[PDB]
Structures are given as structure tokens and as C-alpha cells.
């Protein structure tokens, strides 16, 4: 086509999706990770995660308002990844990298798994 | 913070949101523009448009599944803008620029209004 493109559009959309999340506006699911709960938008989760894409395209699970993650999943690891989904920013630290990588593997977030593998290999 | 950022994340999220829209997955509103209907996600509309942000933060309108636009709104103009919302790409042409600009003004999409004003001024 002969379209023009607004460079910052995708980033501005994501910034507004994060603002809606922070204000709990039109959030439609709560992700339970052991004792912790995280409110989010199903569409954003599906757009970032192979696991959530599978869950919310399921004819029964698409209608659930609560999703309970595997008890082995670390809440801080999940929190860091949920923030990454809504911002493109990953708070990767020596103290959380193992939890972040295991959570990204479970959530099927290949690019996060990739940078975790690379950061781990550099320290060995 | 000490975060790392994945450059393509925002663009990949938007591409997946557009794929969900095309497959009518978790769409939660229909926008009626005279004889035409457009299915979309409220969160994406709010993230792109001052008008939709106002409508869906309203305590009554947030719960509506159908929104009827002003009868003066051109369906093709709306279609071009809805595509822009989900892709960052604006199909701006001599034959549609007036309709696109009027629709962007109504929807409160300042950057689109700006490029329409500039393209119009260049042709006078």
C-alpha cells in the first residue's frame, strides 16, 4: 500500500494500556500466583505470552475471570514479566534472573528466555 | 531503574492485537457508523482516541456492547482510522483526506489531525 506510519504509535498504545492497568480500568482477569493476585487485560496477556494465547483462545477458559498459575511459579518473577508485557522494560537482576527465566519459559515468552540464557552464559 | 528494553515489543503487541481483531477474538464492542459495523477491543480504542477514552471511562457507557457514532461520520474514514489504531499505518489519499481528518477530529486523534492539516496545506 501507499500508507504513512506514525513511528511512536505502538509505544503510545502500550503506555496507555499500562495506564489503564495501573488504574484497574477494563481489566478482565486476575492471575493468581500462590498468595499473590495480579489484575490484567486478557488481550495484552495473549499478545505477549504463548501460554495466555492458548488459555484465552480455549472455548471454556476464554470466559474465566480467574486463572491460577502452577504453584512452582514465583510471584516476583511473574510481576517482573507482567510489567515487561505492559512496558517493553525487563527488570533483570542477578537475584531474580533464575525466577524470571523459569517464569518466561512457562509463559512461553521466547525473547525473554533468550536474553536470560545470554545473561546467565556471560556470568559462567 | 536498571531495566533492559526489547525494541520490537510494542510493535509485536500491536501486531497480535490486530490478529485478534481480524479473527474476532475477545472483541467486546461494535462501533456503528451509519449502515456499517466495526468490531473492536475497547482498550485499544481508548488507547488511541480521546473520544473512546472518555466513553469507556464513563460509569454507564463502559458497559455498553454497541456505540453509535454521529451520523455525519464517514464509514470509510472510520475504517481507515480503526486500521491505523491497530497497525500505526494510515491510508491517507487525496480522495479520503477530508473524511479522515473530520473523523480524526471527532475521535480526538491529534497526530492524525496534524498530518492531515500538513498534507492539505501542501496541496493549496
Amino acid at each position: 500500500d501507499s500508507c504513512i506510519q506514525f513511528t511512536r504509535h505502538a509505544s503510545d498504545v502500550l503506555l496507555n494500556l499500562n495506564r489503564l492497568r495501573s488504574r484497574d480500568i477494563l481489566t478482565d482477569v486476575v492471575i493468581v500466583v500462590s498468595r499473590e493476585q495480579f489484575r490484567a487485560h486478557k488481550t495484552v496477556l495473549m499478545a505477549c505470552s504463548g501460554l495466555f494465547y492458548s488459555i484465552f483462545t480455549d472455548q471454556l477458559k476464554c470466559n474465566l475471570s480467574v486463572i491460577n498459575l502452577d504453584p512452582e511459579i514465583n510471584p516476583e518473577g511473574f510481576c517482573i514479566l507482567l510489567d515487561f508485557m505492559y512496558t517493553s522494560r525487563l527488570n533483570l537482576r542477578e537475584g531474580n534472573i533464575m525466577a524470571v527465566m523459569a517464569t518466561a519459559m512457562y509463559l512461553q515468552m521466547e525473547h525473554v528466555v533468550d536474553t536470560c540464557r545470554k545473561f546467565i552464559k556471560a556470568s559462567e | 531503574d536498571s531495566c533492559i528494553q526489547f525494541t520490537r515489543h510494542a510493535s509485536d503487541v500491536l501486531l497480535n492485537l490486530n490478529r485478534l481483531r481480524s479473527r474476532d477474538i475477545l472483541t467486546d464492542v461494535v462501533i456503528v457508523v451509519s449502515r456499517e459495523q466495526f468490531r473492536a477491543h475497547k482498550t485499544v480504542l481508548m488507547a488511541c482516541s480521546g473520544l473512546f477514552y472518555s466513553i469507556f471511562t464513563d460509569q454507564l457507557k463502559c458497559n455498553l456492547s454497541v456505540i453509535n457514532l454521529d451520523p455525519e461520520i464517514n464509514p470509510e474514514g472510520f475504517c481507515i482510522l480503526l486500521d491505523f489504531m491497530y497497525t500505526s499505518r494510515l491510508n491517507l489519499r487525496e480522495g479520503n483526506i477530508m473524511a479522515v481528518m473530520a473523523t480524526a477530529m471527532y475521535l480526538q486523534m491529534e497526530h492524525v489531525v496534524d498530518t492531515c492539516r500538513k498534507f492539505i496545506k501542501a496541496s493549496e
Binding site: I4, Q5, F6 | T115
Partner: peptide
């Protein structure tokens, strides 16, 4: 705005 750019030519993509």
C-alpha cells in the same frame, strides 16, 4: 510520520 514516515514512509514505512
Amino acid at each position: 510520520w514516515v514512509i514505512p
